[model samples]
Target: MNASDFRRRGKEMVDYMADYLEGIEGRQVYPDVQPGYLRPLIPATAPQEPDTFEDILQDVEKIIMPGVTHWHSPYFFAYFPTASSYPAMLADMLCGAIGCIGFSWAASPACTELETVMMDWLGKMLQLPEAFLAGEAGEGGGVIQGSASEATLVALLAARTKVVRRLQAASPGLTQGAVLEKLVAYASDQAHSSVERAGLIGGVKLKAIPSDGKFAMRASALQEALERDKAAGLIPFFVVATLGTTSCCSFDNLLEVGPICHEEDIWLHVDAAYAGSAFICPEFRHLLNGVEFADSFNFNPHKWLLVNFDCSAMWVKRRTDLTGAFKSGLITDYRHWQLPLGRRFRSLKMWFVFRMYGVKGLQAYIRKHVQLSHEFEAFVLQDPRFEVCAEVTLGLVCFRLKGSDGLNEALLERINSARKIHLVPCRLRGQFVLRFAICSRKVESGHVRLAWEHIRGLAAELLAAE
Candidate 1:
C-alpha cells in the first residue's frame, strides 16, 4: 500500500477503534472462545497474493472480535488496567509514522532527548527524589523500560554488578563464581513473581521474607533474615520492597524496610507498577514514603497514566551503577540502559498524555478509581456472606465468601462462566479470594454496582446449590 492508501485506511481504522471502545460495554468482558479458537478461522499459510486492506480489516471483526477479552469495557475487573486515551493513541500514530529506533542519541536526537524530559516530567509529578530527576545535576536519570518486570531485572543486575565489583576491590582474591554463590537477594512473600524470576535470571538465591499479619513486609522480617544469612556466610546484596503487591495490592512497609537496607549496605529497589501512578495525587503520595532510600524505583505509567502498553518508567540515584560504565562523549547509548538494543519511541505517548491531561486531570482520574473501589468495598461489606480479604487500597478490593474455599471457588467459576464481567482469583493465606480491580478508562460507580450485583447473585446461587 502507498501513502494515499495508508492515509485513507488509517482514518478508517481510527474511527473503527473509537466506535469499538464506545460500544464495548455491550460486549462480554471475557471471550467465550476456548483454546485453538483462532487456528481454524483463517488460512493455514500466507497467501501468494497480497490481500486487499478491505479483506484484512473485515476479517478483524469476524475473527478477532470473538477472541478479544474486551479489556477496555467497564465490566473488566481483572488483573490491572492497560491505559487508553485519545492523546496517547494519536501520539502512537505519530510514533509509528516517525519509525525511529532510539538506541543512541545520534540515532534519533529527538527520541532520546524527549524521553529524558518526559521522564523528568513524570518524576516531578510523582514527587520522586531530586536525585532521580534528569538535568538536576545529571548524576542520575530515568529511562523507559518495557515493563515493570524488566525494570526489576535491570535493577537486580545493576545491584549484582555493583556489589561484585566492590567485593573484588576489597578482597582481590574472590572469583566471580565464588562471589556469585554467596550472593543473595530478598523480597516479601507477597511480592510479584517477577522478582523471583529476576533472581533466577541473575543467578542469585532469593529468600522470601515473611510478611506480617497485614501482609506487609516489615523491617523486622528483613533484619532477621539478613542476620541469619550473614551468620551462614551469605552476602545480602539487594532487597525489593513493593509499594503495591499484585495478589492483593498490599504495600510492604518501606519506611521500616528502607533503613534496614541502608544500614546493611543492601540495594533497595521499589516496584510500584500499579499504584505508582496514584502517587501523583497528594492523598496517595504518602504510600510511597521512604523511596529516598531506594537505589532504584520503577512503575508502569501504561497501567494507569493514560499511556499505552510497553512504557515502564524507571529511575536510579546513580546512572553509572546501572550502566556499569562512566559516560563518555561517544557512549550515551540507551542500549546500555536496558535489555534491548532497539527501543520504541515510547516517550511520545507519555509526552502527549502528560501535556493533554496535566497533573490535576491525572490526579482526578486516580481519585475516581479509588472512590469506585471504596464503593465496591462498601457493597462487599453490606453483604453478610462476603468479607473483604485485604484493605481496599487504591483500585483493588480483595474479598471472599465467608465459607469454605470450595464455595468461593464455585462462586467465582459461575461468575466468570456467565461472562457479564471479568475477574481473577487470588489465594490469600490459604483462602480463595476474588480480586475486584477497578480497571478500564470507563469504569464508574454503575459498573462497580453491576459487578457487585453479579457476584452477589452468583454467591446466592452457589450457596443455594450447596
Candidate 2:
C-alpha cells in the first residue's frame, strides 16, 4: 500500500488494537479449538496478490482470534505475568518502523547507547550494587537478553571460560578437555529447567543441591556438596541461585549460598526472572540481599515490569562480560554478548515503560499483584478442603485440595474445562498443586474474587458428582 493508505490504515489499526485490549474481558481466556484447527480455516498457499487491509482486518476476527489464548485477559491466571502496556506497545511499533539490525555501535548508535543507559537505569532502580552498574566508568555493566534462559546460559558459559583460564594458569600442562571434565555447576533443585539446559549447552555437569524445608537451597547443603565434589577432584565453578523459581515462588538462600560460592571461588549467578521486579519496591528489597556476593545477576522486566517480551535485564559485576567483545576491541558491540548478532532496538520499551510509569507507579503495580496473590491465598485458607502448598509469596499461590493427587488432578481438569478462568498445575513436594498466578496488566481484586468463586463452585460440583 502507498503512504497515504498506510497513514489511514495505521490509525485504523490503533483503534483495533485499543479495542482488543480495552474489551479483552469479553474474549475467551483460553481457545476452545483443537490442535491443527487453523490449518483448515485458511488457504494452504500464500495469496497470489496483496490482500486489502480491510479484508485482513476482517479475517483477524473470523480466523485469527478464535485460535488465540487471550493472555492479557483478566481471567488468565495461568503463568507468571507477561507485561503489556500502551507505552511499551507504541515503542515497539516505533522500533519496528526504524528497524536496524543493531550488532555494533556503528550499526545504530542510538540502539546500543540507549540499551546501555536503560540497563543502568534499571539496575539502579533495583538497588543493584555499584559493581553491577555501569556508571561513568566501571568494570560492571548490564545488558538486555532475550529471556532469563539466555541470561542463565550466558552467565554459565562466561563462568566456564573464566574458571578454565584460572585452572590452566595454575597447571600449565593441563589440557582444555581435562579442565572441562573437572568443571561442575550447581543450582537449587527448585531452579527453573533452563538452568539444567544452561549446563547442558555449556558442556558442564550440573548438580542440583536439594532444597531444605522451604524449597530453598541453604548454605549447609551447598557446603556439603562442595566438600564431596572437591574430594572427587571436581571443580565447582558456577552456582545459579534462583530467587523465584518456576513451579512455585521459592527463593534460594542467596545469603547462605553466596558466601559458600564466593569462598570457594565459584561464580554466583542469581536468576530472579519473575520476582525480580518486586525488588523495585522497598518492602520486597530484602529478598535480594545476598546479591552483593554474586558475580552476575539476571531478571526479566518482560515478566513483571510492563515491558513486553524480550527484555531480560542481566548484569555482571566485572569487565569479563561477553569474552568475544573484549577480543573484538569493542565492548559496545552487543552481537558478541548474545547468541545472535541481529538484535532489535528493544531498549526503547524499557525507556518508555520506566518514564511513563515512573518508579512509584511501577512499585504500585507490583504491590497490587502481591496483594491479589495473598487475597487468593486467603480464599484457599477459607476453604477447609484446600491447603496452601507453598508460601503465598509475590504473585503466585500454590495450593491443592486436601485429598489424593488424582483428586487434585481431576479438580484442575474441571477448572480448565469450564473455561470461566484459566490456571495451571504444579507438583510441590509430591502433591499435585494448582498455581494461581496474578497475570495480565488489567487484573484486579474483583477478578481474583471471581476466579476463586469459579474454582470453589467447580470443586463443589466435582465433589458432589464423585
Candidate 3:
C-alpha cells in the first residue's frame, strides 16, 4: 500500500471500471442468485487485522457480483436509468479526494459559489424563468437535492411551512398540528408513489386526483378536487404535477394544472425527474409548458444527463421559500437548506456534465432515446399479442401482454430470468403492466429492438406452453 504500489493499483482500478462499463451490456441485467445465498459467504464479525485488497476483490466477484442487480447496465431498462459518465465520475472522484465538508460560504467558497453558479447554468439550460436564479439581482435559485423523492418532500414541506407562517401571521396561536391537518396536497393519480410518501413526511393530507382521459391531470379535474376540498373546510395548499410519471411517463397538463393551483393559492411543484432532462433540448421545452407558473420544479440529471447517482437538480421560483423553510437562524450555515450541513462539491460534476453535453449534445442524447422509445411503441403496436398499456410519450413505454395480469407478470419474469434485458412491473388500474425504459446513456435502437424481440419471444413461449 505504498505510493508506487498504490499508483499502479489505481491505474488498474481505472481499467477495471472502464472494462466493467464496456462489458455491462453483455452481462445479465438482473442478478441470478436466490435469496439467502450470500449468508454463508461472510464471517459473523469484522476481521481483526487488515486484509489485502486482493481479498476484497475476490469477494466482489464471488459474493457481491452475484447479488448485484446492475443499475448502471445499459440493459437496465427496469426503473429510470441512473446515467453515469466519465466526466461526472471523475469530478465526483476529485470531490472525494478533496473531501470538503462544505456547510457555509466560509467552509469552502468554491463549493457554495459553484453550486449557486451551476444552478443558474442549469436553470437557463432548462429555459427556467429568471425568478429561479439567485445572485445580487437574481430573483430565484436552484439547489441539488439527493433525489426526486427528496425534492418532492422539500416542496411539500416548503408549502406547509409557508402556509403555516401565512396563517399564523393572519391569526396567531394556530397550532402546527391544526395547520397540518387542514393543509392538503394534490397530485395526479398517475404520479409516482413518492408524492404521497412526501405528504406523509410533511404531515399533510395528500389526495391523488383522477386524471382525464388522456391520462394527464387537467385543470378541470384539479379544480373540482380543490373546490370540493375547500367546501369541506380543508386547506388546498399545494399541487404536484408530475411531468413524466413512473408507470408510463404520463405528464400532467401543466398548462391547465398551473392556473388552478395558482387561483387556489396553492404552490405548484413540478416533478420532471425523467422527462425534465428533455427540457435541456429546445424542441422538448414544451414539456415544461406551465413551468413559468410553478413555484418550484425538479429534475434528475443523474437519471438522464449522464451524471452519476445522487445528483437531483431542483429549482425554486423563490429561493427564500425553500431556504427559509429549512433555515433555523442567521447562523451563516449552508446546512440550513440541506439535510446535511457538509455537502460535497456536487455542483462540479453537474457543471461538467452540462458543459460536456452542451445544449446540442444533451438534445441529441434525449432525441436518440425518445426515437428509440417511439420505435418500441411501433413494435408493440404491430404485435397483436401485446398491448401498449399507456401513452408512449417519452422514453418509457408501459405495455402489457394481451391477456391477464398473470400472463404479463409471467412475461416479465421470463424476460428477467433470460437475463438479456431487464424490466419491472407497474400497476395501471390494478392490472400489472411492464415498464420498458430507454434511459440508459449507451442504449441504442438495436438494444430496444432486441429487447422487444426478447419480450415477444418469451410471451410466445409462455402462450405455447399454456
Candidate 4:
C-alpha cells in the first residue's frame, strides 16, 4: 500500500488495537475452539487475485482469533509474561517502515550504533559492571538473540570453542572429535529444558545435578558431579546456573555454584530469562549476586520486560570466543558471533522500552506483579482446600488443590474448561502443580483476586463431584 493508504489504515488499526485491549477483560482469556477448525476455513491453494485486507481482517476474528489463547490478557497466568507496551509496538512499526537488514556495521550504521549504545544504556540501568560494556579494555559485551534458548546455545557454543582452544594451547595435538568426546556441561535438575537442549545442540555431554528439597542447586551438588565426571575421564567445561527455573521459578544457589566453577576453570553462564527483567528493581538485583563470576549471562527483556517477542539480551565476557564459534574459513571477512549474520532491529524496541519506563518505572512494574503473586499465594494458603506446591518467588506461584493428584487434576481441568482465565500444569517433584504467573501489561490486584475466586469455586465443584 501507498503512504496515504497506510496512514489511513494504520490510524484505524491503532484504534482497533486500543479498543480490543481496553475491552479485553470482558472477553474470555482462553479460546473455546477445538482442533481441525481452521483447515476447513481456507482453500488449499493460493487465490489468483489478491484478497482484500477487509476479507483477511474478517477471517482473523471469525476464523483465527477464536483459536487464539489471548496471551496479552491480564488473566493469562500460565507461563511467563511476554509483555508488550504501546511505545514498543510503535517503535516496531517504525523499524518495519525503515526495513533495514542490519547484518554488519556497513549494512546500516544506525542499526549497529544504536544496538551498541542502547545495550550500554540497558546494562547501566540494570546496574551491570562497567567491564560488561563493549569497546572497553575487558572483552565482555551484549548482543540481541532470538530467545533465551538460542542465547543458551550461543553461550554453550562459545564455552565449547573456548575450552577446545585452551586444550589445544595446552597440547597442540587435540583433535576436534577428541575434545568433543571429553566435553561435559552441568545444570541443576530444576533448570529450564533449554539448558539440556543447548548441550545437545553443542554436541556435548550434559548432566543434571539433583537439587535439594528447596529446589536450589547448591555448590556441593555441582562439586560432587564435577568430581564424578572428572573420574569418568570427561572434561567439565561449562556450568549453567538458572536464576528462575521454568517449572516453578525456583532459583539455583549461584553464590555457591559460582565459586566452584571459578576454581575448577569452568565457564559460568547464568540463564535469568524470566527474572532478568526484575533486576531493574533493586529488590531483584540481589538475585544477580554471583553474576560477576559468570563468563556469560543472558536474560529476556521480552519475557517480563515491556518488549515484544524475539528479543533476548545475551552478554559475554569475551565476544571473541562467541565469534570463533560462528566463524568459518569460507566467510573470512565476516564477523559472526552467533547463528545468523543478518539481524532484526531488536534493540530498537528494547531501547524504546528502557527509555519509556526508565529504571524506577520498570521496577514499579515488576514490584506490582510480585506483590500480586504473593497475594495470590496468600489466598491459596488461607483456603484449607488448596495448598501451594512450591515456594512463591518473582511473579510466578505454583499451587494445587490439597489431596491426591486426581483431585488437583480435576480442578485443573475444570478451571481450564471455563475459558475465563488460562493456566498450564507443570509436574514438580511428582505432584501435578498449576502455575499462576502474573502476566500482561494491565494485570491488577482485582484481576488476581478474581482468578483466585474462580479457582476456589472450581476446586469446590470438583471436590463436590468427588
What lDDT tens digits, residue by residue, belong to model 1 across residues 47-163?
998998889888998899989998899999999898989899999999999999998788898888888888888999999988888774567889999999999999999999888
Give me the overall lDDT of model 2: 0.89
TM-score leader = 1
Q: How accurate locally, in lDDT, is each candidate?
A: 0.90, 0.89, 0.84, 0.84
Backbone steric clashes in candidate 2, count: 0
- For residues 1-466, write the lDDT of model 4, one tens digit per residue: 7889888879978987888888878778887777888898899999998898778778876887788888888889888999678878978988898888888777777777677667677777778876677754547677788899988998888889889998999999989789999999999888898988998889999999898887888988888999999999999999889988888888888889888988988999999999988887777788888888888888998899888887888777666777888871111112365687787677789778888887778888899999999999999999988788888879999998878888878888888888788999898888898899999889999999899999888888788888
Model 2, residue 279: what's the lDDT? 94
Each prediction's TM-score against the native? 0.98, 0.97, 0.95, 0.96
Alpha-carbon runs more than 4 Å astray in model 4:
135-138, 328-335
Whole-model lDDT, candidate 1?
0.90
Tens-place lDDT digits, model 3, residues 1-466: 7879878887878887898888887777788788998878899888999887878878887899889988877678888878788889888878887888788778788887788788888888888887777755765777888888988888888888898998999889898888888889999998888998998888888999998766789988888888899999999999999898887788899898887777777999999998898887777888788888899999998988887888998877776787778861112344645566567889889888778877788788888888999999999999998899887767888888899989888888788778888788988888898998885788878888888888888888899999
RMSD of 1: 1.6
Please report the candidate that would top lDDT against the real structure.
Answer: 1
Stretches of candidate 1 exceeding 4 Å from the true structure? 325-331
Poorly placed runs, candidate 2 (over 4 Å):
324-331
